[PDB]
């Protein structure tokens, strides 16, 4: 089972800056490697496949390179939209395996987007407490 390993595990960067995540496989994956980006509280999105090919509708500032065991994703000029966790996946051998992700946040110097985030966090708490009620309510109905 192939272990893909990313670094850094997190990092900060300023706007306009050039960023480079890496991903290192425990064996040759012949560029069968895809890069996914996941913004907070959103579903993953495909950036790059086969190591270096951009997906559809991906800004060109995103670029990928590497071969053998060692690969890298590079954002050339970092916009603020790009704060996210990035994941590498290999599909050379089964099972498909994934890096643990690099978290990327802004350093240095969009209101309704907070509402879904807050409602999501509250719903976690509600279902948490609903699972705590569940046993007690079963005991009451006996």
């Amino acid at each position: 089972d192939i272990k893909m390993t990313q670094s850094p595990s997190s990092m900060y960067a300023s706007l306009g800056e050039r960023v480079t995540i890496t991903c290192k496989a425990s064996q040759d994956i012949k560029s069968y490697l895809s890069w996914y980006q996941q913004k907070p509280w959103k579903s993953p999105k495909t950036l790059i496949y086969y190591a270096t090919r951009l997906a559809d509708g991906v800004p060109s500032r995103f670029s990928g390179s590497g071969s053998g065991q060692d690969y890298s994703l590079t954002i050339s000029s970092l916009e603020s939209d790009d704060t996210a966790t990035y994941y590498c996946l290999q599909h050379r051998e089964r099972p498909l395996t994934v890096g643990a992700g690099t978290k990327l946040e802004l350093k240095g110097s969009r209101l309704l987007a907070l509402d879904p985030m807050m409602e999501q966090e509250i719903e976690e708490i509600r279902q948490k407490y609903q699972c705590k009620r569940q046993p007690i309510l079963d005991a009451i109905e006996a």
Binding site: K30, S31, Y50, A51, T52, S67
Partner: peptide
């Protein structure tokens, strides 16, 4: 066939 990329 051989190249830099994923093709074989």
């Amino acid at each position: 066939l051989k190249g830099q990329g994923p093709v074989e």
